[PDB]
Ligand binder design. Structure first.
Ligand SMILES: CC(C)N1CCC[C@@H](CO)C1
Length: 93
């Protein structure tokens, strides 16, 4: 059975106005800004942006890749598909 989200989990993350996007739950570095209550720091592959999202917008990658893991015209998306498949746990700083 599923557990709660934890750092390192791979997802497609949904934001208003954008396709379900390859992403990971990030850790929060010591001394870094913490997310709001009940939100997770989501790092978006390809764009390398961070937003804070709750579980309703987080789809586990294994379950969802057949639906959401196809190329998209949007900036950064296809780079992000490579990242989540090929090196999802690397530093992209
Ligand atoms: C869809 C995704 C790559 N972006 C676009 C909006 C900003 C970013 C994180 O704040 C999420």
């Amino acid at each position: 059975m599923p557990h709660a989200f934890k750092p390192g989990d791979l997802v497609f993350a949904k934001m208003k106005g954008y396709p379900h996007w390859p992403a990971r739950i990030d850790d929060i570095a010591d001394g870094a800004v913490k997310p709001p209550p009940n939100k997770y720091p989501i790092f978006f592959f390809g764009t390398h942006e961070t937003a804070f999202l709750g579980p309703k917008d987080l789809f586990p990658y294994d379950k969802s890749k057949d639906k959401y893991g196809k190329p998209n015209k949007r900036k950064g998306f296809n780079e992000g598909l490579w990242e989540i498949q090929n090196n999802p746990h690397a530093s992209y700083s």
